Amino acid sequence: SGFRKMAFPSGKVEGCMVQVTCGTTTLNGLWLDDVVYCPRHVICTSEDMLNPNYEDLLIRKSNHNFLVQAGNVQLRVIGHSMQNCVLKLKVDTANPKTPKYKFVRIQPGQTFSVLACYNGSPSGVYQCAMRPNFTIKGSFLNGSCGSVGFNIDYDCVSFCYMHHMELPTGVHAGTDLEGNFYGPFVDRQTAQAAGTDTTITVNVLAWLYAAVINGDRWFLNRFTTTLNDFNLVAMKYNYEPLTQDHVDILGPLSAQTGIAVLDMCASLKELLQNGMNGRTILGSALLEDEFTPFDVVRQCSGVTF
Amino acid sequence: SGFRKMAFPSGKVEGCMVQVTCGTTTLNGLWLDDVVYCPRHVICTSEDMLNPNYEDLLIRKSNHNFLVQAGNVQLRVIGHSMQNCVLKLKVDTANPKTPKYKFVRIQPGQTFSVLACYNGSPSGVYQCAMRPNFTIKGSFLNGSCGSVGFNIDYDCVSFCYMHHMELPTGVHAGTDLEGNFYGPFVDRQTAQAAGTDTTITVNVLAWLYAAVINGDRWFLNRFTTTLNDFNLVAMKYNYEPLTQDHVDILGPLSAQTGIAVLDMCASLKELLQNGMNGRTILGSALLEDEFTPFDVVRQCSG
Ligand SMILES: O=C(Nc1cncc2ccccc12)[C@@H]1CN(S(=O)(=O)C2CC2)Cc2ccc(Cl)cc21
Numbered sequence: 001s002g003f004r005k006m007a008f009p010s011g012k013v014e015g016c017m018v019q020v021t022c023g024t025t026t027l028n029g030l031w032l033d034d035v036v037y038c039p040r041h042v043i044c045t046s047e048d049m050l051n052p053n054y055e056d057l058l059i060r061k062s063n064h065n066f067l068v069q070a071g072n073v074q075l076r077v078i079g080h081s082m083q084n085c086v087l088k089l090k091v092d093t094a095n096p097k098t099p100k101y102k103f104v105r106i107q108p109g110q111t112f113s114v115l116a117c118y119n120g121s122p123s124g125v126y127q128c129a130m131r132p133n134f135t136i137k138g139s140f141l142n143g144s145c146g147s148v149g150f151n152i153d154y155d156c157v158s159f160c161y162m163h164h165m166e167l168p169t170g171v172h173a174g175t176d177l178e179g180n181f182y183g184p185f186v187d188r189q190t191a192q193a194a195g196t197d198t199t200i201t202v203n204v205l206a207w208l209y210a211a212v213i214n215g216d217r218w219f220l221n222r223f224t225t226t227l228n229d230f231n232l233v234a235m236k237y238n239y240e241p242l243t244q245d246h247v248d249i250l251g252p253l254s255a256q257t258g259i260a261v262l263d264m265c266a267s268l269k270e271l272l273q274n275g276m277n278g279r280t281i282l283g284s285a286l287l288e289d290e291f292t293p294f295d296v297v298r299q300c301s302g303v304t305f
Numbered sequence: 306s307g308f309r310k311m312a313f314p315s316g317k318v319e320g321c322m323v324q325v326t327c328g329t330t331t332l333n334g335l336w337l338d339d340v341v342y343c344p345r346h347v348i349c350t351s352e353d354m355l356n357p358n359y360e361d362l363l364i365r366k367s368n369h370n371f372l373v374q375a376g377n378v379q380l381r382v383i384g385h386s387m388q389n390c391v392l393k394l395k396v397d398t399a400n401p402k403t404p405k406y407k408f409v410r411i412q413p414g415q416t417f418s419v420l421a422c423y424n425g426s427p428s429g430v431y432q433c434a435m436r437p438n439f440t441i442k443g444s445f446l447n448g449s450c451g452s453v454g455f456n457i458d459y460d461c462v463s464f465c466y467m468h469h470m471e472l473p474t475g476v477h478a479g480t481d482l483e484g485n486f487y488g489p490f491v492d493r494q495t496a497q498a499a500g501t502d503t504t505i506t507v508n509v510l511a512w513l514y515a516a517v518i519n520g521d522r523w524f525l526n527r528f529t530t531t532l533n534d535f536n537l538v539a540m541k542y543n544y545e546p547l548t549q550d551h552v553d554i555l556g557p558l559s560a561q562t563g564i565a566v567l568d569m570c571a572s573l574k575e576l577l578q579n580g581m582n583g584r585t586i587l588g589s590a591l592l593e594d595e596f597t598p599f600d601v602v603r604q605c606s607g
């Protein structure tokens with residue numbers, strides 16, 4: 001019993017974290033085989049971050065300008081290239097701790113673990129979700145740039161996120177490992193704002209099934225609804241539309257608990273229109289949307305890595 | 306900016322997790338140097354669980370009865386001893402991945418990270434607090450016994466908890482790494498119940514200072530309170546008494562924000578009376594009590 005916000009064990013990623021220094025800027029890099037990946041804004045100064053021509057800034061740098069530190073060892077940079085918003089530093093030594101890995105781009109509503117780092121040293125691990133507005137509600141301070149997001153499937157680490165910046169509202173923006181930003185963001189000091197956020201409906205439903213599996217049933221009702229009727233209700237409360245794919249994905253949880261997806265939707269509609277009324281669900285007075293249907297199955301069955 | 310429930314990176318602990326099998330029971334063990342630590346109930350035949358005589362059960366065992374597996378390698382048990390509710394299995398190989406470590410016993414209110422494991426394999430990491438009633442609100446299934454709680458300071462891992470059992474309310478009970486249980490629990494399937502749980506007041510106050518540091522001030526008021534008037538009100542909401550030690554501990558956060566501890570105590574009293582009125586504090590509609598004053602300073606400064 002119990003339901004916690006759980007992250008993947010971070011060990012496979014810890015053995016990849018390095019510190020990257022260029023001029024006055026120090027941030028984190030990810031050392032896989034003989035390449036160190038880090039945000040390209042590590043080459044920016046004070047005037048540069050205003051209007052940066054990264055090709056112009058990069059051509060002026062030599063390999064010895066990038067100081068890379070893996071623990072108490074300095075790695076020697078033998079080449080450099082840029083791929084979108086990520087800098088790739090070729091090093092002379094292949095990381096002996098390199099795990100089996102893939103670079104994957106995730107969709108909004110998917111979750112991942114973040115290994116927050118400062119000066120190439122891991123300090124914490126937390127679980128979070130890519131918001132529908134493409135931001136992440138992370139916990140980051142200055143120097144955390146280059147910290148990575150990942151999932152672990154069996155023994156393979158899927159790297160999906162690299163931290164680049166904080167938006168004025170305190171939320172965070174970054175890229176996949178190929179340097180493509182999630183969201184309409186750019187890596188420079190300029191007026192940027194996160195769009196209006198919405199609730200990840202499929203995730204709230206998965207979390208309601210997790211509550212049922214854990215003995216919480218007060219919110220259940222005899223009623224059912226249609227996808228059209230539920231999507232009208234959901235649009236009024238800034239909830240993401242629920243698709244037939246979402247219903248199909250929730251099928252195993254519907255079979256285990258005996259509550260049809262549209263039956264749980266009628267429970268969710270009643271909760272949106274009437275509130276919790278002093279009650280909680282899994283120790284929360286708000287509807288939680290940072291557990292996917294897969295996270296619920298994985299945790300309520302104990303899958304290991 | 307941002308405030309997340311953050312766990313310590315688990316790598317140093319992952320390299321210590323092993324599987325321990327004795328008869329029909331399989332659970333997790335912690336391999337440090339040449340010793341594997343695990344719950345002593347791994348020797349129980351479920352027919353013993355009501356009133357086990359662990360000394361009587363252990364004397365009948367030999368080293369070769371304990372099968373220890375570290376990954377796809379079987380370790381050889383060369384000795385065994387019991388220290389309180391923990392079994393210590395001496396093995397013929399020292400763990401090369403053994404980090405710098407200490408065994409620490411924590412007090413209620415203290416937080417720690419849990420590396421949940423099944424069959425010696427880590428499956429997840431989460432952040433926990435030792436409840437005032439000595440239980441932990443964990444996320445554990447059968448086979449998770451032997452999973453450990455820890456903190457990391459600098460490069461040293463402080464092991465503070467080992468999981469032993471789930472109580473009838475779904476909460477969890479366990480020991481420190483010397484085998485001493487937290488709370489009035491026994492490693493027996495006898496009728497046992499957690500005492501009434503209370504809110505960790507010092508932790509809620511630390512979390513209110515974390516909200517002020519991140520820009521949330523809506524809950525502050527022009528009032529102050531005496532410590533005794535605060536406790537008289539707090540007790541009525543099942544909040545733990547706030548001691549002068551708690552007030553002293555909150556001093557650095559009071560100095561950083563410019564809000565006296567007893568002024569923040571008056572804010573908590575008003576929140577307990579009014580509720581949140583549709584608002585949230587650090588993305589939560591409930592008062593959070595699983596961040597200590599030390600956690601707040603660490604996550605908001607380094
Ligand atoms: O509590 C225990 N295990 C667990 C531990 N954590 C979370 C669980 C979730 C769900 C099922 C078990 C869980 C064990 C085993 N169980 S039991 O499963 O009820 C038994 C029929 C095998 C009795 C028991 C009694 C005393 C002691 Cl010390 C340990 C234990």
Ligand SMILES: [Cl-]
Nearest residue numbers: 410411412415
């Ligand atoms: Cl303590």
